[PDB]
Design a binder for these strands. Structure first.
Ligand SMILES: [Mg+2]
Ligand SMILES: [Mg+2]
Ligand SMILES: [Mg+2]
Ligand SMILES: [Mg+2]
Ligand SMILES: [Zn+2]
Lengths: 221, 24, 71, 102, 83, 135, 220, 129, 83
RNA sequence: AGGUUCGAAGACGAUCAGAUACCGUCGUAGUUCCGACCAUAAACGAUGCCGACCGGCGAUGCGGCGGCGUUAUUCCCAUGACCCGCCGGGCAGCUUCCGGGAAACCAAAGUCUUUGGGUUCCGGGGGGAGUAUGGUUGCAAAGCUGAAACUUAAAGGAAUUGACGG
């Protein structure tokens, strides 16, 4: 995103800070060092928000380059991210893989879950190590999310990020879906997207049973 | 046979041979 | 590692002829002990007189009486 | 076939290590090679802690502890089941076994 | 990183590098103006002084040589020399 | 004890749930009757063993998803889970806890000096590592 | 009677991919043996290299399986080597032929000197390795033939190498490692960078994105 | 100790090239090293290079273009005549189509094709292809 | 290829990695070819034409396919210089 | 010289079919010190030395250079005890499809058919045999150097499966 229309907005800066994308971990990977801005006195590495915006746009231009929207496949094995990838594919027309990624999905053609994608998207290189490894057998370019300590072994468009925070992950998928839609012919670049970013947030089952009844109590009162 | 005890047996045989040569 | 210097030909040649004594074929063909010990004395064939007819048992897996002569 | 990278002993920069005696058989074992189990035992067993405390003239006494450091050769350690054989991959794990305290 | 710009490294890592392992060698030491108390003149002391430098006019010692760098006595103001 | 279902009865029970979901219900006897014609089972014992596990499964799936799959069960449960629809987003905080180093990064970006943001006191002590060694 | 399961097989079947080199260009793995016999039709000559009876010691004395080595390829610049271990010799033969078909690579041919006609030898001296076996192919002048052991000789003849010197090292008696080393050396003839290949590459569309409009309607 | 600066330069270039790096730094710079780099760069096997001048023996930064298979050296600088330059070509070069042997002649440091063209032999330095 | 008669005697010309210039072999299944859809200036929508990059298996396996792609896009203007 | 303990040899008591042993009780030489010999160990990292290059990470020992802070005393700094880093030299460790290797494994055992940085020692199927003989060293025990005849189709290394284990 080298253009004025593809420039970060103040509201997007606020969303990034609120979610916690700028925050990282206490461990630095030598291949993620370029995206790191500075390490605070707490030890948490701080991530250049300008650089994650550029990598987010780079991944967006990569995704929209594929004519078949379902050719790209979004994979998230961690509970902080099934909802994000499911809603991502629901908006962008992609193909989601929520939960465990069974081995042999890309290499073994016998099982019914076998598929032939043209692009792979990962929430965590550490958690989703298996789909990344199988991407190396099938000529599969990968956009993957990141961490300050993530291994970039088969990662190409690693967007600097905080993949541990539930709010950060949901926002990361939200802006990725927003940007691919926006540079496609679905959003006219002017008005804010009608989709609220919290739609992709994964809420724990510890409160999924009590928030709806407390909401009903608030509505009647 | 254990190599160490084969070595020890060999030393006995060498000492016997030196005894016989000195005798002549 | 082996020396590759431009003026090491003496050491290379001396080491070769020193180490050549460590293989059986060169040692037996140049020491002369094998030639002396050979009953034929380096000859392909040799004539003799049959002292007696003898029979020799075969090795362990086989079982036969090989027919030989002491000559 | 080198079984262990460290040859079963914690000697890296040394030439020689003074030996010790196994507390079970008096085997001369290098100190860096022997199995050291430092036990903190109760002076009185858990069945008789009550009887000693009841008979104690003091209103609040704390029973002492035996601090004995034990040195084992690997043969007495294995025979006494202090250490066990492990898999090829399991042998490379140097963390102490869990205490199972709760 | 395959495409590190060896020819033009930024100053911070050059300062971080060892003096001989810099792209061009540069001594870490420096000369500095040292003003001993109770005098007027300015004497030059090596930052890695190995001998006890003596303020000539004023009696008190200036720097006690230690392992790496000179140990300036209290009250001794020092200024750098052309970086 | 000893009531574990074989993979034969289990897989057969799953399969008929996959294909015939509307035809089946919560009642055991009705499920065993529909099992007569949606599938052929040479054994009566297998017939009501399969039907028994079908009612057990359908009771479980009436309130959640299992390793069985229905194409309808995917789509209406994704139509559901709309959102908690909070009146406002959770990321529109009026004030954001921002480190002074972070604000320095933001002004380098040039998006600093926002009235929404407020700087926080930097932590002092620099002791973030855990004590090395056991305890 | 061939229903392709892969996207690539579908494109080959419906005449969308016009050459096997089109797949080789984008390095797409071949997962169906019926993909390539459509291209190299009736030109692949099959030879069995060895049937070795591997044994596994059980309580029942031993159990026996047969490992079949198969070299295949038209004598024009394609060669493949396949290994299959199976209980039956016939099943191992069919499995090894399928695997050899799948692992078919193109063979680069050059000239020993003074390039006049068609290329005949290896473009440069190459080295393949497997186990301890080190096999080195060496360019040879026109007419010298293929001087080698019989196992790499038939492998190179199928590759289409008319002239080649070879040098082998290690336990060449191990036929599997000897054939794999030769096949490895043959495969890396294109992987070797050469001044005539120094020219910058122009990129074309992969068959997936070139026929993605066709894949949605046929191979749904 | 370091007894062949050209050998260390060529081995460093080879290791960085195999590693895939865009640049390589050679710590000891020499006239022989610079001439060797010049004949490699003229043939196109490397890019531009810089000579960092310290008052000691300088350094060199070479721009690798990713088209160098091997740049070995022949440390004992054997006397290669023209009648046996063909044997060295067969022993060292990967083919008769490309590849070069660098040998210092009385007309300067040059490749074997140029040495044959002006009919001069010399001491073999190394090879690259 | 291209003997002195002029005809291209080769059955195909392999691609080369746009980051390390190595030949991408026909059995290199870790190598990729990816496209970045460049946008237009006035509205930032995809304009049909895109930009192609290729990464070989070795570069994409040692972990530096990410940095290589970033550098290629930076050189081609997809990524602005202020990165 | 001194001999506390331990303890070759030895004795006795056990055990066993036997037990010249393993177990127990004594116990000589020795174990200790000084001097004079000997020059050998699985003297091991079973892994030459010097030099160059080629991944990452967290520690640790020494020295040095920086920096939030807590602590020691006093009135400030040093200066010590910690804390966060950097550099160099070390003992190492974890991880890695750098690469190697027969593999076990090794950031060296890598940079090797794409074979050459410098230079020592040293191996050539298994036995006979580290024997015979000669020379030399030693008070001796023995050390260093060191064959041949003859004999043999395998001996070995690493991994795999099984079988077995007091
Ligand atoms: Mg020792
Ligand atoms: Mg006693
Ligand atoms: Mg040397
Ligand atoms: Mg021998
Ligand atoms: Zn013991």
């Amino acid at each position: 995103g080298a253009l004025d229309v593809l420039q970060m907005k103040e509201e997007d800066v606020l969303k990034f800070l609120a979610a916690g994308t700028h925050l990282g971990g206490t461990n630095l990977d030598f291949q993620m060092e370029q995206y790191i801005y500075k390490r605070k006195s707490d030890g948490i590495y701080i991530i250049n928000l300008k650089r994650t915006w550029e990598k987010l746009l780079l991944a967006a231009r990569a995704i929209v380059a594929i004519e078949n929207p379902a050719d790209v496949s979004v994979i998230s094995s961690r509970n902080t991210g099934q909802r994000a990838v499911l809603k991502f594919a629901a908006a962008t027309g992609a193909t989601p893989i929520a939960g465990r990624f069974t081995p042999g999905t890309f290499t073994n053609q016998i099982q019914a879950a076998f598929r032939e994608p043209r692009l792979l998207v990962v929430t965590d290189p550490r958690a989703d190590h298996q789909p990344l490894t199988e991407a190396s057998y099938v000529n599969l370019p990968t956009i993957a999310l990141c961490n300050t300590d993530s291994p970039l072994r088969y990662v190409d468009i690693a967007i600097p990020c905080n993949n541990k925070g539930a709010h950060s992950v949901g926002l990361m998928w939200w802006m990725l879906a927003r940007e691919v839609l926006r540079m496609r012919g679905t959003i006219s670049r002017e008005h804010p997207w009608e989709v609220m970013p919290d739609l992709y947030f994964y809420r724990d089952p510890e409160e999924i049973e009590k928030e709806e009844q407390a909401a009903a109590e608030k509505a009647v009162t | 046979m254990r190599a160490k005890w084969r070595k020890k047996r060999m030393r006995r045989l060498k000492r016997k041979r030196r005894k016989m040569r000195q005798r002549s | 590692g082996k020396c590759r210097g431009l003026r090491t030909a003496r050491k290379l040649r001396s080491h070769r002829r020193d180490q050549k004594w460590h293989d059986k074929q060169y040692k037996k063909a140049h020491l002369g002990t094998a030639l002396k010990a050979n009953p034929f004395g380096g000859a392909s064939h040799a004539k003799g007189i049959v002292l007696e007819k003898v029979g020799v048992e075969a090795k362990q897996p086989n079982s036969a009486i090989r027919k030989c002569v002491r000559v | 076939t080198k079984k262990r990278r460290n040859n079963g002993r914690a000697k890296k920069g040394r030439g020689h290590v003074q030996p010790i005696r196994c507390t079970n058989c008096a085997r001369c074992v290098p100190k860096d090679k022997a199995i050291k189990k430092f036990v903190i035992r109760n002076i009185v067993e858990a069945a008789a802690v009550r009887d000693i405390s009841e008979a104690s003239v003091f209103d609040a006494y704390v029973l002492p502890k035996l601090y004995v450091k034990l040195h084992y050769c690997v043969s007495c350690a294995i025979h006494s089941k202090v250490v066990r054989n492990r898999s090829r991959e399991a042998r490379k794990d140097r963390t102490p076994p869990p205490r199972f305290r709760p | 990183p395959l495409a590190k710009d060896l020819l033009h490294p930024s100053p911070e890592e050059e300062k971080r590098k060892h003096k001989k392992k810099r792209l061009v060698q540069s001594p870490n030491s420096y000369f500095m103006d040292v003003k001993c108390p109770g005098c007027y003149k300015i004497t030059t002391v090596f930052s890695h002084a190995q001998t006890v430098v003596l303020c000539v006019g004023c009696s008190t010692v200036l720097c006690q040589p230690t392992g790496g760098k000179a140990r300036l006595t209290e009250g001794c103001s020092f200024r750098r020399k052309q970086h | 004890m000893g009531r574990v279902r074989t993979k034969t009865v289990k897989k057969a029970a799953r399969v008929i749930i996959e294909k015939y979901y509307t035809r089946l219900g919560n009642d055991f006897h009705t499920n065993k009757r529909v099992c007569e014609e949606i599938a052929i089972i040479p054994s009566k014992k297998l017939r009501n063993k399969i039907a028994g596990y079908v009612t057990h499964l359908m009771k479980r799936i009436q309130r959640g998803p299992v390793r069985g799959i229905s194409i309808k069960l995917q789509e209406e449960e994704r139509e559901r889970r709309d959102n908690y629809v909070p009146e406002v987003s959770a990321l529109d905080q009026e004030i954001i806890e921002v480190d002074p180093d972070t604000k320095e990064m933001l002004k380098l970006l040039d998006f600093g000096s926002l009235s929404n943001l407020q700087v926080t006191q930097p932590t002092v002590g620099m002791n973030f590592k855990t004590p090395r060694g056991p305890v | 009677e061939w229903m392709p399961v892969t996207k690539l097989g579908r494109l080959v079947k419906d005449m969308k991919i016009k050459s096997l080199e089109e797949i080789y260009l984008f390095s797409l793995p071949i997962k169906e043996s019926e993909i390539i016999d459509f291209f190299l039709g009736a030109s692949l000559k099959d030879e069995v290299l060895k049937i070795m009876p591997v044994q596994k010691q059980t309580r029942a004395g031993q159990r026996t399986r047969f490992k079949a080595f198969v070299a295949i390829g038209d004598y024009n610049g394609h060669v493949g080597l396949g290994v299959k271990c199976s209980k039956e010799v016939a099943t191992a033969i069919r499995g090894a032929i399928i695997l050899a078909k799948l692992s078919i690579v193109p063979v680069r041919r050059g000239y020993w000197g003074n390039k006049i006609g068609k290329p005949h030898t290896v473009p440069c001296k190459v080295t393949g390795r497997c186990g301890s076996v080190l096999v080195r192919l060496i360019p040879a002048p026109r007419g010298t033939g293929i001087v080698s052991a019989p196992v790499p000789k038939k492998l190179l003849m199928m590759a289409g190498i008319d002239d080649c010197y070879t040098s082998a090292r290690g336990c060449t008696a191990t036929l599997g490692n000897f054939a794999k080393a030769t096949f490895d050396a043959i495969s890396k003839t294109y992987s070797y960078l050469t001044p005539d290949l120094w020219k910058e590459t122009v990129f074309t569309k992969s068959p997936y994105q070139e026929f993605t409009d066709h894949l949605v309607k046929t191979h749904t | 100790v370091r007894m062949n600066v050209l050998a260390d330069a060529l081995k460093s270039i080879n290791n960085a090239e195999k590693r895939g790096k865009r640049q390589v730094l050679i710590r000891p710079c020499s006239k022989v090293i610079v001439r060797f780099l010049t004949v490699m760069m003229k043939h196109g096997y490397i890019g531009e290079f810089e000579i960092i001048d310290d008052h000691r023996a300088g350094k060199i930064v070479v721009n690798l273009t990713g088209r160098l298979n091997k740049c070995g050296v022949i440390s004992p600088r054997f006397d290669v005549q023209l009648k046996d330059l063909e044997k060295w070509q067969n022993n060292l070069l990967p083919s008769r189509q490309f590849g070069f042997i660098v040998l210092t002649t009385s007309a300067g440091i040059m490749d074997h094709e140029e040495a044959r063209r002006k009919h001069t032999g010399g001491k073999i330095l190394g090879f690259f292809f | 290829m291209q003997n002195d008669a002029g005809e291209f005697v080769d059955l195909y010309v392999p691609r080369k990695c746009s980051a390390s210039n190595r030949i991408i072999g026909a059995k290199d299944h870790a190598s990729i070819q990816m496209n970045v859809a460049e946008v237009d200036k006035v509205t930032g929508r995809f304009n049909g034409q895109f930009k192609t990059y290729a990464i070989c298996g070795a570069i994409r396996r040692m972990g530096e396919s990410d940095d290589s792609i970033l550098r290629l896009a930076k050189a081609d203007g997809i990524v602005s210089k202020n990165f």
